[model samples]
Target: KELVLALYDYQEKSPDEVTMKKGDILTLLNSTNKDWWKVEVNDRQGFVPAAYVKKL
Candidate 1:
């Protein structure tokens, strides 16, 4: 399972959105290479390139 990262106002940008709310869970999909993991939350899906997130 992948951890979750809460989105702060500073983290939000246009296009990328970072639209996930404070308590949402990001579900992990198959990884690419050995580093990034594809993830989905709500109706938004994207790749989390970090090795780990800050939340459990």
Candidate 2:
């Protein structure tokens, strides 16, 4: 499943602080761990914790 940025992390707690726009295509990267996903939203690349996203 694809997840748009519903909210932005204002405190910069997340690696990428930029708010994710609607309809943005999140790119998944290769990883050995199944739970941790390396995703690229716009120009920002970060790991999306398993709890935040669903299967596509």
Candidate 3:
């Protein structure tokens, strides 16, 4: 299921990732990676660390 988060400045390690800030809302895309999840933010999609986001 897709979820939303209120923050996204997640010490991101991927260069080809969505650039987001503290109050940005992100939609969870893929969570199969465990360590990282593909997410959608501001109409773009990229990978983010799973631990940093809490699903809602």
lDDT scores of the candidates, listed in order: 0.52, 0.48, 0.73
List, residue by residue over 1-56, the lDDT tens digit for candidate 2.
44433222322256533234434456655335675556666677666544344445
Model 1 gets an lDDT of: 0.52
Candidate 2 lDDT for residue 15? 53
List where candidate 3 sits over 4 angstroms from the true fold.
6-8, 11-13
Candidate 3 lDDT over 1-56, as tens digits, reads 67767454765566856666666668888889977778888788888777677788
**What TM-score does structure 3 among the candidates reach?**
0.72
TM-score of each: 0.43, 0.45, 0.72
Q: How much is the lDDT of residue 41 in candidate 2?
A: 68
Model 1 residue 1 CA deviation in Å: 7.9
lDDT of 1 by residue, 1-56 (tens): 77566443123355533345555567765555465445576677665544444346
Model 3 error, position 47 (Å): 0.2
Candidate 1 residue pairs that clash: none
lDDT of 2: 0.48
For candidate 2, the C-alpha RMSD (Å) to the true structure equals 4.9
Q: Considering lDDT, where higher is better, how would the candidates rank from best to worst?
A: 3, 1, 2
Q: Pick the candidate with the highest TM-score.
A: 3
Work out how many backbone clashes candidate 2 has. 2
